Amino acid sequence: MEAAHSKSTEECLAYFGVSETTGLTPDQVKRHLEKYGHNELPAEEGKSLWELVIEQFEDLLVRILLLAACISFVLAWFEEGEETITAFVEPFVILLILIANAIVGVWQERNAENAIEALKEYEPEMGKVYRADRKSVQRIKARDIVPGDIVEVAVGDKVPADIRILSIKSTTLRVDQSILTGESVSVIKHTEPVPDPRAVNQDKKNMLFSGTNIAAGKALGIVATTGVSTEIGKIRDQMAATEQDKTPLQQKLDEFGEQLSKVISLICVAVWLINIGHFNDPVHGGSWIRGAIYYFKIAVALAVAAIPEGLPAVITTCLALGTRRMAKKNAIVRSLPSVETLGCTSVICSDKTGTLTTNQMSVCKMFIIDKVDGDFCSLNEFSITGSTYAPEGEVLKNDKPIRSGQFDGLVELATICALCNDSSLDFNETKGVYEKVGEATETALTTLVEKMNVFNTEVRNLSKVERANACNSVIRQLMKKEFTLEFSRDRKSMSVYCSPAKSSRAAVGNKMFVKGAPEGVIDRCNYVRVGTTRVPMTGPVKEKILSVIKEWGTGRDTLRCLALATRDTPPKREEMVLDDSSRFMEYETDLTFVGVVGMLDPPRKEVMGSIQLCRDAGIRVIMITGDNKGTAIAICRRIGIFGENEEVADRAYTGREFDDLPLAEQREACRRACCFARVEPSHKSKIVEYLQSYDEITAMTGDGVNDAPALKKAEIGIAMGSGTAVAKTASEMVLADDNFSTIVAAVEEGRAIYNNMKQFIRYLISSNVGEVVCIFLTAALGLPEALIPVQLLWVNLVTDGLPATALGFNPPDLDIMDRPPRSPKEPLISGWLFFRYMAIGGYVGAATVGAAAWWFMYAEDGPGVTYHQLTHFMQCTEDHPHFEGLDCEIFEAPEPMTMALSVLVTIEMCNALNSLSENQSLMRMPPWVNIWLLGSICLSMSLHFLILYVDPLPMIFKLKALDLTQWLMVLKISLPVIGLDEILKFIARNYLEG
Template sequence: AFGAFLSKVILVICIAVWLVNIRNFKAHGSWFSGALYYFKIAIALAVAAIPEGLPAVVTTCLALGTKRMSKRNAIVRHLPAVEALGCTTVICSDKTGTLTTNNMSVLRVALLASRDQVLELDIAGTGLDPRGTATLLPTSGEAGSAQHVQFPAARLGGNLGALLGEIAEVGTLCNESNIVYDLSSKSYFKIGEGTEAALAVLAERIGVSDEKLCAEFELWSEAARVTAVRSACLQKWTKEATLDFSRDRKSMSVLVRPLDGAAASESVGMKLLVKGAPENIISRCTYAREYDNGIPKRRALSEDAKKRMLAKVEEFSSQSALRCLAIAVRDVREEFGPSGESQFASDMLAAKDVSQFAAFEDRMTLLGVVGMIDPPRQEVAEALRMCESAGVRVIVVTGDNPLTAAAICRMIGLLPSSSSDAIDSELMITGAQWDAMTSAQRLRAAQTARVFARVEPVHKLQLVEALQTHHGEIVAMTGDGVNDAPALKKADIGVAMGSGTAVAREVSSMVLADDNFATIVAAVEEGRAIYANMKQFIRYLISSNIGEVWCIFLTALLGLPEALIPVQLLWVNLVTDGLPATALSFNPEDDDIMLQRPRGMDDAVVDGWLFFRYMVVGTYVGIATVGGFVWWFMAYSAGPLMSWADLTSFTNCSEKAAQLHGYSCSVFTHNGAGTMALTILVTIEMLNALNSVSENHSMLQFSPFRNPLLIGACALSMVLHAVILYVPFFNRIFQTTALNAEEWGAVLAFSVPVVLIDEILKGIARFRESRAARQVSSRPKTD
């Protein structure tokens, strides 16, 4: 829009200059000669007005901005996203791995003992080290002290040791992740998903039921020890079938068969090992585990026991921000017999429809619940504070349990801290609640909620649509899965995780190499800085070009000789101005850039006030350039010292009359005056560039030396200008001449006031901003 407006203005000015001078056509010898002369002036005016270097500088600025973003782990895939980032008003972020470290560690294990008592173990240590200890906490409501538990669990003996050993089997077999030890760095790292990696580590810490074998583990190398329990379980069991995780049932299961010899010795057959969301798993459990001389048996699971376990899950989630998984098994042989288990396996292998999976995960035996922590990233809390200051609203969108999500959000400051576990229904919305809402209720929820829990990918898409369509928000949405692709595509800025699927990365506008929420905020800050820099070099180029237009226009209007010729204007626009304009792309962001409200996507790059500033500075540039040109003719001690009347009647110059006044008519073709005008124009533009490091901050407060490249670019531009002044070859091309000390003094006298003018305009801009801020803060709030 600004380009179209600028083109129309240039066209009107060029025509106006030509028409205004119709009366002067005959003064150039003939009407045709005059028309041609002022047509060339109009062309020169167009050359002066058009910022030829602007497209290249804009592209360079965007490219440099994306390079800086990549260094901060934000990889921009589409350049328009850079502009949108600076406009972002809402960030919809995943929790796991984005707000948190995605380094899960099991901290609690809840077991159902005899008489339906809930036993709780505190697991010591975080990270991926396979060695650890535990503490058996006192039963709620009973006196007693905590008991230290030394792993492996085989040393414990009894029902507790056997139950923990079976949990370890489920944790390592119903699992697609693995832990490996890197010999070069002497550290552990996970292969696969964080939740499953935490279960694998827990299994290695618990050990196997054979105490002698566990003792041998301690003699193994680090690389072998980290998968010792997994190896032992795979020597005992083989996987027959797997039912992958699905969002509707929120569970995963593996059917295992004992290897030859194991069934006879253990008197067991096939088992279905299951892990998943506690509320789903516990509701489908019918039995609890007990042992008879180490042989697993099952007993009826009462409704009261289910309630106790669910209460423990709620305690883990709300008080300790633990993500909980229930562990269960289905004793296929005990339920169906040796002949029936084969049919069960065949039916399970034949099941292709995800909706059929839940039928196999029924009548299960509950083993326990594990609670794992995914700690928040340290930098997230500060990033959230920056978002609040910048007017960017953050919404957490997660598939986790609402209590766990709320606890994490309290830890990072997104939800208010509270001694109560109750959650404000306006701040926390679940996927089920969203589905039950009317359109009007959804719009209100999208406006007020800060956390959406237990959501599906379709809910993400619906949330983006509600925010965009009805609230006019500029939305950044994160995602990593194939099912997240529609929401990523719909969002103004789709943000994919570097660890996510190729589909998610393909449809996104930006990829986070480190999956970190703080990187999104850094990208928003960088987007704002890039836009601010674009405004600054546009301001620099346009105000300079307006000065050139004024110069051409005034000389034509006042009947003066040409001050600047087209080749000089091209040199200034493409070379002299181009270097500082490009250097302005490296401006550091303003200190208060994340204290400003987001701009609108439809906001003009150049608003009315900014255009007024362009005009004021540009007008002075034009007046100073023409003033220096006139000074050379009328006041320069080595110049012709002619009168104004003689200067404006140069087309009617008579050699005889001129000599009476002490000059020759050839003085009007002398390069001195034009060189003065060109040098003043270049000098003012260098000062203008130095004052463009910040849009509204004073040069004294925001020093140009904060951008060393700009200092270098201005210095190089002045060197290049000196070349065309003092090298004879370039004198002939650009019709310039060398300047002496008196002329340079006049150049500085005409040029320096532009700094004062711009400082005054910046002061007015700061006053306007502060007044607008006071008006907003004093405006009464409405519910």
């Protein structure tokens, strides 16, 4: 319950009323366990099987198609004759498709997995507590510990709950809290109060956080909070909440699915106004049962003409293809929808350590004393190449390599690094790369030697495995490490007492090798090493050294520096108390300064040009890290996020600072700041939300669990391939190769897909505007229906399907990565395109019904009932207006419809070749520029002549036509559409632009 790391240990105990020595009593554990509950994170329970099936059903797109398919039963029963058992295919097929959309859609909900579960993997099973009923410590279930009881932790343990350190038994406590800062560096705790209320995790040096593990030492503390009220418990709470929003495209489809509903609901009320021929014109005559199906039969037909149910099928297949495509470029997408959103990305938020950097400490600079004369001190600076722990680099003076051994000082520099170091390198045979063993800040020195190769020992022939410790192995031979004075906060340094090899009885030859914070170690040096000689430490030589240290640890090259010294004449081995660290400082006195090393977790090789590529595509890249501002800014200046001299004083905040800005100032800082450092997991998330409060599509790139809350928050979570499982689990996309450059490639691919997608969506829907105009006409006049929903489904699912989907392969425009991000506000159809389709809509809305009055009015090989009053009487419920009457059911012939249906099917093959572009006539847009588009159309008109000749088929769809001329008739009703369009473009391509 207690949320203070700012109180004394004595006050914290007082808080819970527990003794540091005894521990909680049974009664207290009864009440605390009561008031606070168990120490465990709640699991989010996954897919609700009744709520993944329901999501597919609740969208007017299926609601309307439902009532319709359902009304296709009310009107399915009313049919005299045996033609009622062979007239349920329509209501059948209809529903059957809504089932396919359900099945198909659902199957791709690939969040297969639990990030919350992945997180819980950080809560240990057991914990160690001290409670009143026993003197010995007890190992209980971690979920049984409560705020208030004394807990004990040590080397290897995984902190069971947020704890306030009360006492450190080891001379120091080394904790690894990357799980909350993304940094593996071990942090050194203490038990003093941290005064700042608003302190961040990176500040609570007197707290132990649930989920982190103890790198070194043993300690005693009091449990401050448990379960959901802990830092990792917060990450958990932020993940649970956040849900992904509908795609910019999905969105368009939504508003559309609403209007499309408002429209029809009015088109019907519009026919009830025109067709008041059953409310104020006729007589008694029954039409309240027969002519009553003229207000329902068109209801379930008007629906299938507005709802392009088949569009989903196209996108899904399109996206799925993109997936595998990107997967070849090394980006594994786990959710299709983000594939489209990835195209329109304006902001990429990114983690530093392990994402933009390799996360492998490296010694990149080092220097030794060169020359001394009073008041003049010159050094010998050096640079080291290599960004990995791999011994893959060479040292070099003035950008030109120089064998280290030819320099005496560097022989000692290298010796201290190898000897005063409790870590090691190691080639992982499986993964195929070297990895560190111990403190990464130390393994950096281990690798530094293998590179320095001071004794020239041959290592070129060695195995990749054994060359890992070659040069260091040698050095171990040269000197025997006796014992090592640990590191202590009071001296910020450590040491190793060593003795000359092959010397058994003598006194002389021994020496200690020291390392640590420059300031402190330097001050304890009375002599400086000059190659092999040794001269005293004067003010001029002091400041000189310091100067370079000061520059090296703050510039555009902020580096962690270590002073390296040696005590030539260490005290008598039997004159030291090796059990009292408080005495190590004096044993580390009268030292001889040797050199300085500069570390850094360097940028991945390709990040700089990747950042550039984003800049060109007008995408902003913001860095958000748990590491320190000093370091973040220096990485941004190398990565290219900041220019080398660019004033940054107002566009790079630390989490604390940022918490201090007003809400308004914050939202604003997000648009200008590009570097937020020393943040907590929530800060990352927060910044993303603000960035999203500008309608911007934001991406989050990370590899840590501290990156989880923002990954789940961005429109697109991108985890590293080498990242943590939880980060991966929370992302929509993974980088199989860890190269920040593949994000660039993925954005490209996504841009290209979004275009082509946009095409088949304005093509496959435009048709519906024609199908609806067609129906509305053939009902606002009274004419015989030329098209029935049954056919209106094949045409939209296959007939249009194949073409529409061929457009998805539209050749990606060249120079598509030099254009800014598509604005989310931008509707797919508005302006002149709204009219161009508003035009191509009316044309087909007519040319289909008119094809019907060609088999009746202008009828040659058919019922030439030239102006027989289709509008007036189609009824024929007395053959009186016709003398010689004995046949009126010709208004039901399968030919007047096989026209509109053939025209339609033929018009769409055109618009498909017309929609291969937006402002480019087919003369500049050759139809053969899309191989798959030609084949599709072939495949289309070849499916028409299938459901037109295959005996069973036309039985269900209605009867044939001979190419006589009737087909040629269908042509001069469609083909001109091409001309019409080709013109509408020139009207824009020139009158609007060019």
